[PDB]
């Protein structure tokens, strides 16, 4: 049933329920004093394990299964590090000044200096966490934002010259509109006026620009690690990185 997907027929409460049920688990770190190679090894090992759970989660984002396998691959390839980072920022909301990569790996700002060039990325992630805390981001809004990242990050890098590729973009934009409806639904339910609903919607979506910025910086750093060949990267992580270059 790809003509009239079930994602279009979901109510706002059923969208929120679906996304909450789809949530990946919080994985642990398999973690002696820190070094540059060990800290990056922990982070890339964690990332590689989370990537497997992300694939399962994406298949449960409403509308994502209606896409072709090729389009699903492209969306995860573009979005995967944005998705990891917004997850990280969300988990770090209640830990000001700290990044909760895992329940047993809670890194403060100064611990990012044992890896060169990582402190800038750390500061950007912390500032986003502070922003989400300042806005009192809710779990229901978080899962909407994360799904928007998945569907949006690669929607404009598609091909627009096929009769069947243009209807794939419309479906993506129709699912995206539904998630916007859902965010607005949650804000109206929380008692915000119309003016506050639109302002808060704008505020949340502008943070996605910063998340895109951080993922671009993080991709260059990851590429800088692959090149130095000092930190082991899984075959899957190497492929996800290779898709950005």
């Amino acid at each position: 049933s790809k003509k009239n997907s079930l994602a279009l027929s979901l109510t706002a409460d059923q969208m929120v329920s679906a996304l909450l049920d789809a949530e990946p688990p919080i994985l642990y770190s398999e973690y002696r004093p820190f070094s540059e190679a060990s800290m990056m090894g922990l982070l890339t090992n964690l990332a590689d394990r989370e990537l497997v759970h992300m694939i399962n989660w994406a298949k449960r984002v409403p509308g994502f299964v209606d896409l072709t396998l090729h389009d699903q691959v492209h969306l995860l390839e573009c979005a995967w590090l944005e998705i990891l980072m917004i997850g990280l920022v969300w988990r770090s909301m209640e830990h000001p000044g700290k990044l909760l990569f895992a329940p047993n790996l809670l890194l403060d700002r100064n611990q990012g200096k044992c890896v060169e060039g990582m402190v800038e990325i750390f500061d950007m992630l912390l500032a986003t966490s502070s922003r989400f805390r300042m806005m009192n981001l809710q779990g229901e809004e978080f899962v909407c934002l994360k799904s928007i990242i998945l569907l949006n990050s690669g929607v404009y890098t598609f091909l627009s010259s096929t009769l069947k590729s243009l209807e794939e973009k419309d479906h993506i934009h129709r699912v995206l509109d539904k998630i916007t409806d859902t965010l607005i639904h949650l804000m109206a339910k929380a008692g915000l006026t119309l003016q506050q609903q639109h302002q808060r919607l704008a505020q949340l979506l502008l943070i996605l620009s910063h998340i895109r910025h951080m993922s671009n910086k993080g991709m260059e750093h990851l590429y800088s690690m692959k090149c130095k060949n000092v930190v082991p990267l899984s075959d899957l992580l190497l492929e996800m990185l290779d898709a950005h270059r």
Binding site: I55, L69, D235, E239
Partner: peptide, 9 residues
């Protein structure tokens, strides 16, 4: 290619 295999399974 790994991502293809993961999405199908």
């Amino acid at each position: 290619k790994i991502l293809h295999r993961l999405l199908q399974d």
